[PDB]
C-alpha cells in the first residue's frame, strides 16, 4: 500500500485534550426569549434565532483588476422567525391581537440559559451569550389547520423585526 | 471530560411545572369554520387557514447607514386555501356555482371548537380565539381526477379573499 | 397536567352522525369524459381535470391604506392537462391527426357517474356534478419513449383548451 | 456474445500498482484553519472551505463565429463559510462580537496536518498544502434554536471574506 | 447465605384471597360476535378481536427539551382479522359473495357469553363486556387450498373495517 | 497440556462470599403497581416495566476525527407495556372504557415489595425501589379471542404512558 502510512496516539490525545478540556457545548434546546411586559408568555416560544452580527461591505475595483472588501456601516435592523404553540386559551392569539392594535413596540432578552448553570427553580444566565434586541414589531403568520394532521399542535410563526442588537 | 457539569432536577420540575399548569393544546384537528346562511356545508370544511395577522412596514434610512423599521398602515385584505370533500350530490359544486353565478359577498366565523370546553351536541367557541371575515369571495380551482387514486377521494380547493379581519 | 381536560362523547357522536349522515364520498376513479361525435374515445381517458370555476379579482386602493377585492370580469376561457393510453391500432394518434388536421371545435361533457347511482350497463349522471366546455381545442404533447420503462404503457399527454365553462 | 471480449490482470495490476504507489489520500477531517492572536479559537472550527483558485476569463468572437476564451486579472478577493459550534461559555459568541465592534482585519492560515505526518503533540505541516488569507473579514449569521433539536448543538455559521490568497 | 431472608405465610395467603376474591377468569374460548340480520352465520365465528380502545396523541416540546404527551381526537374506526369455518355448502363463501356484491353496510355485537352467567340454551350478556360495532365493511382474503394439510379444515379469514365502536 | 495450569480456592470463596454478602436478588415476580383512586384494581396486574432512566445524547465531531457524547436534556415522557387479566365481570374493561370517556389524567406508583420486607398481609416497600409516574395515560390494545386457546385466558395489554418519572 501507501509508503507513509506511520500514526502516533499522542497527538490524537492531544487533539481529544484540547477539544474537551474547553467546557460543555450549547444544546440547541437550552435558550430563553423574554419580552418586555409579558413574562408569561416567555414559557410558550418553542423555536428562536439569534439575529444576525454583521455589517455591510464596500466594493472596491482597484488598478489591474484587483478586488477589495471593506467594511461598512453596521446592518442593525433585521428580521427574524419564531415558533411558538397556541393554547385552548388563546393566550398567543390574545397578545398578537393586543400587539397589531396598540401599535407599540416591545423589547426582547435573548438568553442562553443551560441546566449546567442554572440554580434554583431561576435561570442562570451570563453576559456573554445574552443579547437584546429594542424597538422590535412583532407580526403573526397564516397558520395551517388541517384535519389530517391529527397528531399535531397549532404552531403559529410569529416575525419579529428588530431595529437594534444590544450586548452588555 | 468537560469540567463545568453539575446539573440539578428542581430546575427541571419548574419549567415542566410552568410548561404543563398553562392548559391544554389546541390540536389542529378541531376546528369550525362557518359560513353565513349556509351552514349545512360547514360540516364539509377540511382544511383552513387563520388568515394574515400583520400590517405592512415603512423603511426608513438614517444617518451614517442606520436603519429603521416603523409600522404602517394595516394589512386587511388577503387570501387563504381551503380544502374541501366533494360529494356524490356535488353540495360544494352546487355551492360554487351558485356563488360565482351570483357575484355575492358571504361572511366567514372562524372558530377553535376543542372537545374540551364543547358542551351538549353543539360547539362551544370563545371570544379569543374567535374571527370573522366580511365582504369574502370564494373561487374554485382545478381538481384532479385521475384513475391511478383509486383510494383517494376528490379535494375540490378553494380560494377565499377575505377584505377585512374582525375580531371581538 | 392540564387542569381543564374534561371530555364527553355525544359531541364526537354529533359530528360524526352530522358528516356521515349527509352522503357517499365522490371516488377520484369515478368519472365521465366524453367529446361530441367521438364516443368511442371516451373510454380511453384515464386522467382529467374540472376546469377552473373563478373570475378575475380587482385591486382598488382606498383612503388610508385600507385595500378592498372587487369581483371583475368572469374567466371564461382556460387550459387543462389529460392523460389518455395509447393503443396498438394508434386510436388516440389518429384522432389526434384528425384534429389537428381538420382544424376544428369539438365540445366535451364532463360528468361524476359513480357506480352508486348507476343504472344498467350504462352510467347515469347528474345535473349538478355536470360540466360542458364549448369550442375546444385538442393538441397533443410529447411522449417519453424509454426502454427501461419495460413495465409502463405509453400516456399521450392531451392539452385541452376551452372557451367556456356551461352548467345546466 | 460479443466477440472481442479478451481480458487480462497485467493492465490491471499495473493501473493498481500506479494508483497507489503515490501516496496517502488526504482526508477530509484533517485540516487546521488558525487566526492570528486568537489561537484558542482554532480548535473550535468544525468545517471550512479552501477559497477560490481562478482567475476571470475574457470572451473574444474571433472571424466566421468562431470563439476564445483568454486569461484575465486574477480573482483574488472571495467569500467561505464556515461552521462553528458554539459552547457554554459563548467563546465564539465573545470573538464574533469582539470581531464585530473592533472593525479590524485579521489574516488566516489554512493548513493540511494528517495524522501520518505529525510530529509529538503539535501539528506538522507542508508548503504545499498551506494557504494564507490577508485582510479578512468575518461575519456571523442567525443560527438555528429549535426546541425539536433536542440531539444537536449550536452550529455558528461565519462568513469569511478574504481579500488576497497567498502561497509560499 | 443471605441475612434478609425471614418469611411470612399470611401476606401470601391475603394475596392469594385478595386475587381469588376478584371472580372467574374470562376464557379465551367463551365470545359470541354477532352480525345484523345474519344470525345463522355467527356460529361458524372461529376467532375475531376486540376493537383498539385508544385515541391518539399529540408530542409537546417544551422548554429546556422537556417532553408532554396530551390527548387529542378519538380513534373511531380499525381494522381487524376473523377466523372462520368454511362448511361444505359454502354458508360463509355465500355471505362474503353478497355483501361485496350489495356494497352494504352492516352492525355486529361483540359479547363475553361465559358458561358460568349463562341460563338455558340461550346466551346470557352484560354490559360491562358488550360491545358494538356500527357501519363495518367485511372483506375476504386468499384460502390457502393445500392438498398436503390433509388433516385441516378450510379456515377463511374475514378483514372486518369498523367506522364506529360504541358501548351502553 | 497447558503450562500456567495453577488454580487456588481462597480466591474462589473470596468472590463467593463477596457476591452472597450483597443480599436477596429481587425476583422477577415480586412488584406491585398501584394507580390513584383505584387500589381495586392493582390486584389483576400481570406484567409491567419499570420506565426508561435515562437523558438524550449530544454528538460532537471534533477536530482531526474525534468525537464526544455529551449529556443533553433529560427524556422524561415515554411508553411502556402491561399486561393485565380479564375478569368476568370486566372489572379492567370497565376500567378502560372509564378511562377514555373521561379524558383524565392518573398518577401510577411501581414498588418492589418483596416477600423478605413484607409485613403483616400488607405489602411493605422501601424509598430505594420506588417510581412514581405522573399525569399517565392508559390506553387499551387488541386482545386475541382465538377458540383454539381453550386453555388460556384473556390477557388484556395497556399502553401506559407518562410524563414525568418521580423518586423521593
Redesign the interface.
Known amino acids: 500500500?501507501?509508503?507513509?502510512?506511520?500514526?502516533?496516539r499522542?497527538?490524537?490525545?492531544?487533539?481529544?485534550t484540547?477539544?474537551?478540556?474547553?467546557?460543555?457545548?450549547?444544546?440547541?434546546?437550552?435558550?430563553?426569549l423574554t419580552f418586555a411586559g409579558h413574562e408569561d408568555i416567555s414559557?410558550?416560544?418553542?423555536?428562536?434565532?439569534?439575529?444576525?452580527?454583521?455589517?455591510?461591505?464596500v466594493e472596491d475595483y482597484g488598478p489591474?483588476?484587483?478586488?477589495?472588501?471593506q467594511?461598512?456601516?453596521?446592518?442593525?435592523?433585521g428580521e427574524?422567525q419564531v415558533?411558538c404553540?397556541?393554547?385552548?386559551?388563546?393566550?398567543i392569539?390574545?397578545f398578537?391581537?393586543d400587539r397589531?392594535a396598540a401599535?407599540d413596540y416591545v423589547d426582547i432578552t435573548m438568553a442562553?440559559?443551560?441546566?449546567?448553570?442554572?440554580?434554583?427553580?431561576?435561570?442562570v444566565t451570563?453576559a456573554?451569550?445574552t443579547i437584546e434586541m429594542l424597538?422590535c414589531?412583532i407580526?403573526?403568520?397564516?397558520?395551517?389547520?388541517?384535519?389530517?394532521?391529527?397528531?399535531?399542535?397549532?404552531r403559529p410563526s410569529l416575525?419579529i423585526?428588530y431595529?437594534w442588537i444590544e450586548?452588555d
Open positions: 500500500g501507501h509508503n507513509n502510512t506511520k500514526g502516533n499522542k497527538f490524537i490525545k492531544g487533539r481529544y484540547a477539544n474537551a478540556a474547553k467546557g460543555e457545548r450549547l444544546v440547541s434546546s437550552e435558550f430563553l414559557v410558550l416560544v418553542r423555536t428562536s434565532q439569534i439575529p444576525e452580527m454583521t455589517r455591510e461591505d489591474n483588476g484587483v478586488k477589495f472588501n467594511h461598512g456601516p453596521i446592518r442593525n435592523s427574524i415558533q404553540v397556541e393554547t385552548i386559551e388563546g393566550d392569539l390574545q398578537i391581537k397589531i401599535k442562553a440559559t443551560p441546566e449546567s448553570k442554572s440554580s434554583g427553580v431561576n435561570a451570563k456573554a451569550t424597538d414589531k407580526y403573526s403568520d397564516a397558520i395551517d389547520f388541517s384535519t389530517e394532521d391529527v397528531t399535531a399542535a397549532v416575525r423585526v431595529n450586548w
